[PDB]
Design an enzyme around this catalytic site. Structure first.
Site, short mmCIF file in Angstrom:
data_model
loop_
_atom_site.label_atom_id
_atom_site.label_comp_id
_atom_site.label_asym_id
_atom_site.label_seq_id
_atom_site.Cartn_x
_atom_site.Cartn_y
_atom_site.Cartn_z
N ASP A 63 -2.06 0.91 1.74
CA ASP A 63 -1.65 2.18 1.17
C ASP A 63 -2.50 2.61 -0.02
OD1 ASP A 63 -0.77 0.53 -0.88
OD2 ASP A 63 1.34 0.97 -0.62
N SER B 233 -2.74 0.88 -2.89
CA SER B 233 -2.38 0.05 -4.02
C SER B 233 -3.18 -1.24 -3.95
CB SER B 233 -0.88 -0.24 -4.01
OG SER B 233 -0.55 -1.02 -2.89
N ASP C 15 -2.98 -5.56 -5.24
CA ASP C 15 -2.21 -6.69 -5.77
C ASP C 15 -3.08 -7.49 -6.72
OD1 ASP C 15 -0.11 -5.92 -4.11
OD2 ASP C 15 -0.26 -7.65 -2.80
N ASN D 270 1.84 -5.86 -7.49
CA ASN D 270 1.38 -4.65 -6.81
C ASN D 270 1.37 -3.46 -7.77
OD1 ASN D 270 0.91 -2.47 -5.09
ND2 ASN D 270 2.19 -3.29 -3.45
N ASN E 236 -4.24 -3.18 -0.73
CA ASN E 236 -3.24 -2.94 0.29
C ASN E 236 -3.62 -1.70 1.11
OD1 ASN E 236 -1.54 -5.10 -0.66
ND2 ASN E 236 -0.94 -3.74 -2.35
N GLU F 32 -0.03 -16.62 -2.38
CA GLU F 32 -0.43 -15.28 -2.82
C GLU F 32 -1.87 -15.27 -3.33
OE1 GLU F 32 0.93 -12.61 -2.28
OE2 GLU F 32 3.08 -12.92 -1.96
#
Ligand SMILES: [Cl-]
Ligand SMILES: [Cl-]
Ligand SMILES: [Cl-]
Ligand SMILES: [Cl-]
Ligand SMILES: [Cl-]
Ligand SMILES: [Cl-]
Ligand SMILES: [Cl-]
Ligand code: NA
Ligand SMILES: [Tb+3]
EC number: 3.2.1.17
Length: 129
Positions: free
Chosen positions: A48, A50, A52, A59, A46, A35
């Protein structure tokens, strides 16, 4: 902070992640490797909108507030920037809430595609835990 592998394992264990919801310590170290590459300051946007955050790429769509994810939740009740600290306490407490959701560690795409089913114990091999 860029953690060492065993350094992160020790910190995760101390904060009670080892065997949390049945997931052995190596699963968590493996997830963190893919990650964030063990970098607490890691951030990734991301598709969309958002973002992380941190060692476990938590998120903003559901779990922390960054003020720029319209229509999202803040279920860990924490600013997303708190997940970038050198002290992983905040990331661990939140991860515990994430993995307690119905899907377990599958919530971490990198865990599912790169750790799930593999010899994750290798990630704590040689550590003085
Ligand atoms: Cl490594
Ligand atoms: Cl393990
Ligand atoms: Cl997340
Ligand atoms: Cl927001
Ligand atoms: Cl909103
Ligand atoms: Cl820590
Ligand atoms: Cl599970
Ligand atoms: Na949010
Ligand atoms: Tb849910």
């Amino acid at each position: 902070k860029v953690f060492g592998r065993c350094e992160l394992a020790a910190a995760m264990k101390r904060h009670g992640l080892d065997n949390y919801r049945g997931y052995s310590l190596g699963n968590w170290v493996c997830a963190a490797k893919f990650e964030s590459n063990f970098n607490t300051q890691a951030t990734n946007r991301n598709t969309d909108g958002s973002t992380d955050y941190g060692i476990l790429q938590i998120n903003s769509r559901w779990w922390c507030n960054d003020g720029r994810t319209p229509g999202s939740r803040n279920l860990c009740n924490i600013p997303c920037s708190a997940l970038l600290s050198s002290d992983i306490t905040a990331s661990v407490n939140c991860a515990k809430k994430i993995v307690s959701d119905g899907n377990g560690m599958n919530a971490w795409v990198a865990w599912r595609n790169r750790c799930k089913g593999t010899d994750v114990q290798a990630w704590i091999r040689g550590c003085r835990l």
